[PDB]
Design a protein around this ligand. Structure first.
Ligand SMILES: Cc1cc2nc3c(=O)[nH]c(=O)nc-3n(C[C@H](O)[C@H](O)[C@H](O)COP(=O)(O)OP(=O)(O)OC[C@H]3O[C@@H](n4cnc5c(N)ncnc54)[C@H](O)[C@@H]3O)c2cc1C
Ligand SMILES: CCCCCCCCCCCCCCCC[N+](C)(C)C
Ligand SMILES: CCCCCCCCCCCCCCCC[N+](C)(C)C
Ligand SMILES: CCCCCCCCCCCCCCCC[N+](C)(C)C
Length: 433
């Protein structure tokens, strides 16, 4: 049709659940799956529709490229587990092993790229083979078919993944449901009841579910959920426009990242996803409190963050920091995000793409949207225990949640159940700030 939809679990809201997941995005869905495999019966509550936010509004690349030591193995294994996903689910998630070329900006960028590849080749940290190398000549020109500029050198992540926003998370939701995961849609989680340390209930607009174990995977809303429970989660909003164009017989295929803001990725159906580099950070109330911690990100001149003043500031001041569980929460008050794509920005970006790859000159515009992130000061995920509430774990605050989800899921479940974590959880801890 155009977008793809998964229907929620029908009937009455259950009295009891072994574990309740807040949010039916990728992180919530994958964590649910991981828990079921361990033998737990899970219930996901979702304020809107399944994968209505970030998890159907992403660019679509699963890459380990330029990733720091903190997140590399989370991405490296994410790629590996996504390669087994189609076989595991038995339905096409649209995950493809695609390949990605990034032409560096400066000679200095080329040295930084070379060093990063060389450092990671000598010490991989996994028995999964590392498949990223610098490419020149014929190998590069085959990857850039019908390019105007004579590009000489690029970093080639051969095993870079591709997933499509209109399909990926939705298939994973249906697979979750087939495992016995119950997902209740249009059903916002306001907060939780706690008695003598142990969680007793999760309170929703449809009623209360008795549980002692909670997974918070509310995407951009995770901070606001933990605010009402008096736990500080440091995230700031970020926005990026995305667009989707039709295919071409003379189109180059694969994933391409070029100087001059040229970024495109071929989908499973032959259509092309493209976007500008520019990330828009709107001014919120939180900007005045801990926005100073985000200043070293504005340091890089290759960094594309614009500070913007819009309606988010006004919305921020009129979102409550505290609410009673028997009254209307901001998750109901601001249920559906209404953020629009920057249409002049997307147009200029597309015109640059058409100038570099004239194969796209005849391509028709399929879809244009805005995508909202929430990012921590060091740009790394929050996958953590919550000291203040035993049995509560949080899986959120990531710009790479699709790639990271199969490993994030296991790591979240490990923290919840007291098992030794898959990877070092210290860089993903809530208390690192
Ligand atoms: C423009 C853009 C491009 C991106 N490109 C890429 C990419 O190329 N590669 C990549 O790996 N990643 C990419 N990402 C990131 C990826 O989309 C996210 O990191 C991932 O979807 C995070 O999943 P999530 O479940 O935490 O958040 P979401 O998918 O937003 O899920 C959170 C859900 O929780 C629900 N919720 C919140 N509060 C409550 C409540 N109180 N009660 C009930 N439900 C609640 C929300 O309605 C929402 O559906 C991109 C993101 C954006 C915005
Ligand atoms: C320069 C320092 C001024 C201190 C005031 C800080 C508090 C903010 C007061 C509200 C200002 C209104 C901003 C409205 C922006 C929304 N729109 C862009 C959509 C109009
Ligand atoms: C001359 C410039 C005046 C600009 C002032 C406009 C500010 C209006 C913004 C709305 C303020 C939010 C309302 C507070 C209620 C929310 N809380 C209950 C959470 C405090
Ligand atoms: C002075 C106030 C500073 C506030 C700036 C806040 C910065 C917002 C953080 C955005 C940077 C994260 C970039 C990740 C984007 C990656 N993806 C495009 C893949 C999602």
């Amino acid at each position: 049709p155009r977008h793809g939809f998964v229907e929620g679990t029908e009937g009455a809201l259950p009295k009891q659940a072994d574990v309740v997941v807040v949010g039916a995005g990728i992180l919530g869905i994958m964590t649910a799956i991981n828990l079921v495999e361990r033998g737990l019966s899970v219930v996901i509550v979702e304020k809107g529709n399944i994968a209505g936010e970030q998890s159907s509004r992403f660019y679509g690349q699963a890459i380990s490229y330029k990733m720091p030591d903190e997140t590399f193995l989370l991405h490296h294994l994410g790629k590996h587990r996504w390669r087994e996903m189609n076989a595991k689910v038995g339905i096409d998630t649209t995950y493809r092993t695609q390949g990605r070329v990034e032409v560096p900006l400066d000679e200095e960028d080329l040295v930084n790229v070379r060093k990063w590849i060389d450092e990671r080749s000598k010490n991989v940290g996994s028995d999964i083979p590392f498949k990223t190398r610098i490419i020149e000549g014929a190998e590069l020109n085959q990857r850039l078919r019908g390019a105007t500029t004579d590009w000489k050198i690029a970093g080639f992540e051969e095993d870079s993944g591709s997933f499509d926003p209109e399909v990926a998370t939705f298939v994973m939701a249906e697979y979750a449901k087939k495992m016995g995961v119950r997902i209740y849609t249009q059903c916002a989680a306001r907060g939780l009841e706690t008695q003598a340390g142990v969680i007793s209930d999760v309170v929703t607009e449809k009623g209360a579910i008795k549980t002692s174990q909670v997974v918070v995977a509310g995407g951009v809303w995770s901070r606001l959920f933990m605010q009402n429970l008096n736990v500080d989660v440091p995230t700031l909003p970020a926005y990026q426009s995305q667009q989707l164009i039709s295919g071409s017989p003379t189109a180059p295929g694969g994933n391409v990242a070029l100087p001059g803001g040229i970024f495109f990725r071929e989908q499973a159906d032959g259509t092309y996803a493209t976007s500008p580099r520019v990330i828009v950070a709107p001014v919120v109330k939180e900007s005045f409190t801990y926005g100073y911690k985000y200043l070293p990100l504005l340091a890089l001149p290759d960094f594309p963050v614009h500070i913007s003043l819009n309606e988010q500031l006004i919305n921020s001041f009129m979102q409550s920091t505290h609410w009673n569980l028997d009254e209307v929460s901001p998750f109901e008050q601001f249920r559906n995000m209404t953020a629009l794509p920057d249409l002049p920005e997307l147009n200029a970006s597309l015109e640059k793409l058409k100038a570099e790859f004239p194969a796209f000159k005849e391509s028709k515009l399929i879809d244009q949207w805005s995508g909202a992130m929430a990012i921590a000061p060091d740009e790394n995920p929050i996958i953590s225990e919550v000291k203040e509430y035993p049995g509560l774990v949080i899986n959120t605050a990531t710009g790479w949640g699709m790639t990271e989800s199969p490993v994030s899921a296991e790591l979240t479940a490990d923290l919840l159940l007291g098992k030794k974590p898959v990877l070092d959880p210290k860089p993903f801890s809530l208390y690192r700030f």
